[PDB]
RNA sequence: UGUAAAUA
């Protein structure tokens, strides 16, 4: 029998086990669920430099094959961690080839993102090289989102501007990737970590399709990350947007998160517009706060801006409200929506 | 009364 079917078997009997034991039966040891936490526990556990460096050859020997192994993947991940730096050129040289398709696989994208995480500017530069070939799929793929994101997060802006002119390529894409499950977390990682020069055409293709893209599943926390991350002429056009139209963005299930973001993160004078425009009537209809509050989706709008807004903007709304409660009990949940409200109006 | 990611 060979050292793992030994091993399985009675484990205690082998707790004198070490790392230069295995030589050769590494791939056996990496692929197996017993195994791989052998391998692992000795690697983090082990005060012997030469253990460790005794099956990296293995290691990387058979990298293919255990980065995408539900057990191996574990193992390979060993050696991107500080204090195996003396390996990180070796293991990506053994993988660079086949990042393309890594990059897309549940179990090898771990490993890619583990090695962004951990190595040099150098390496990840060498890894991305890769990832230019393939990066407008991967940005949507359920796993290769998680990569793009990485590079996103740890690489310094000028070398992921592939990635924003990728988002930038066609008049299209950027809608493409915001109404995109997984697109738009790379978006916004973009807005999160990318310079203002690359941030300000990203922006400026949201906006061309902001009112679609606000009431996205996905987009409207697409648009929210422009609120927190854009510029203040960026905040302006939002929310003038927003007043301009506030009834229809208030009462659409998604734009309405929209609001509230613009409440939440807007000066004294944007709540100004938003709560001007709840509080200008019609001749003959009710003014548009009085509205919000029967609406599904507007009533958690209109209690929003009475916890963010100042005193002053508070007593307008309170003033605009109050002729109106007994209408409001009527209304679904409206008993609920003005007791959450009941401190203000005492 | 209302929203979002791939490992033992
Ligand atoms: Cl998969």
């Given at each position: 029998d060979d050292l793992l079917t030994r091993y399985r078997a009675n484990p205690a009997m082998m707790k004198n086990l070490k790392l230069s034991d295995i030589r050769g039966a590494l791939l056996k040891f990496a692929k197996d669920q017993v195994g791989s936490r052998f391998i692992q526990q000795e690697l983090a556990s082990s005060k012997d430099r030469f253990e460790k460096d005794s099956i990296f050859d293995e290691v990387v020997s058979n990298a293919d094959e255990l980065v995408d192994d539900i057990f191996g993947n574990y193992v390979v991940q060993k050696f991107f961690e500080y204090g195996e730096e003396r390996h990180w050129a070796r293991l990506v040289d053994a993988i660079i080839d086949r990042v393309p398709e890594y990059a897309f696989q549940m179990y090898a994208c771990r490993v890619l993102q583990k090695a962004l995480e951990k190595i040099n500017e150098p390496l990840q530069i060498k890894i991305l090289s890769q990832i230019r070939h393939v990066i407008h799929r991967c940005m949507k793929d359920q796993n290769g989102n998680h990569v793009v994101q990485k590079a996103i997060e740890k690489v310094s802006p000028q070398y992921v501007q592939f990635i924003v002119d990728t988002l930038l390529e066609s008049s299209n894409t950027i809608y493409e990737m915001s109404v995109d499950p997984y697109g738009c977390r790379v978006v916004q990682r973009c807005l999160e970590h990318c310079s203002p020069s690359q941030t300000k055409p990203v922006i400026g293709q949201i906006h061309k399709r902001f009112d679609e893209i606000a009431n996205n599943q996905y987009g409207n926390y697409v648009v929210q990350h422009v609120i927190e991350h854009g510029s203040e002429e960026d905040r302006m056009v939002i929310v003038t947007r927003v007043s301009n139209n506030l009834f229809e963005f208030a009462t659409h299930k998604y734009s309405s998160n929209v609001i509230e973001k613009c409440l939440e993160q807007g000066a004294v004078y944007h709540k100004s517009m938003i709560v001007g425009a709840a509080c200008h009537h019609q001749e003959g209809s009710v003014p548009i706060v009085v509205q919000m509050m029967k609406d599904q989706y507007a009533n958690y709008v209109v209690q929003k801006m009475f916890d963010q807004v100042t005193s002053e903007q508070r007593r307008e709304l309170i003033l605009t409200v109050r002729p109106h409660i007994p209408v409001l009990?009527?209304?679904?949940?409206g008993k609920h929506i003005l007791a959450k409200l009941e401190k203000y109006f005492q």
């Open positions: 009990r009527q209304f679904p949940h």
